[PDB]
């Protein structure tokens, strides 16, 4: 119920299902964005995953244990968004990040646009390590989107 | 509300992939609620 991989986060009511986001299972911990689940418990097969840590300002939450993803963008190399859009198979999109320049340092940022339920899709370095999650960002003047590469602290 | 997860794939880098998108350099601020905004 916690095998490594990328997962869709779904909700179902009486009718069908809706994909509200995506997350990463690594080292027995599920990692996603706070705005996807709001820390609600997650069903995985017959099991239940409970929130362990989170931070609304970082827009991150982990389940079952502390945040495990610690790879960092090197500030130089191209990366891949492993986008998992609703209703579409996972696909890798290679890009050279831009930068969010903030008063508290710079953050890599990817100019790729996907539906809201793609939130939490992992961004990867060339070694396949998860350098952050996609889906907390800004809209620029032409209407397109730029997502921070949001990484937690391990 | 039943919130659940389902596997979608293995986390792997794709060799010879589509390189797309630009690399914007933006001045942004982050509020305590986790919202980024452009500095004007």
């Amino acid at each position: 119920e916690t095998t490594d991989g990328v997962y869709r986060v779904m909700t179902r009511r009486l009718l069908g299902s809706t994909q509200v986001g995506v997350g990463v299972m690594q080292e027995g911990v599920f990692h996603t964005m706070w705005h996807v689940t709001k820390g609600a418990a997650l069903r995985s097969g017959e099991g239940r995953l409970d929130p362990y840590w989170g931070d609304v300002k970082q827009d991150l939450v982990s389940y079952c244990g502390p945040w495990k993803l610690d790879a960092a963008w090197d500030g130089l190399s191209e990366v891949q968004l492993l986008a998992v859009p609703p209703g579409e198979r996972a696909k890798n999109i290679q890009t050279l990040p831009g930068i969010f320049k903030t008063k508290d340092g710079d953050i890599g940022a990817v100019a790729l646009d996907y539906p809201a339920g793609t939130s939490g899709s992992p961004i990867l370095d060339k070694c396949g390590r998860v350098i952050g999650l996609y889906g907390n960002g800004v809209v620029i003047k032409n209407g397109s989107y730029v997502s921070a590469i949001t990484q937690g602290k391990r | 509300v039943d919130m659940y997860i389902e596997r979608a794939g293995d986390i792997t880098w794709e060799k010879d992939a589509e390189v797309t998108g630009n690399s914007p350099r933006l001045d942004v601020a982050l509020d305590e609620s986790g919202d980024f905004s452009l500095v004007e």
């Binding site: 964005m33 705005h35 996907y114 809201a116 939130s119 889906g135 907390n136 960002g137 809209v139 | 980024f36």
Partner: peptide, 4 residues
Amino acid sequence: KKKX
């Protein structure tokens, strides 16, 4: 776009 959370900012489709």
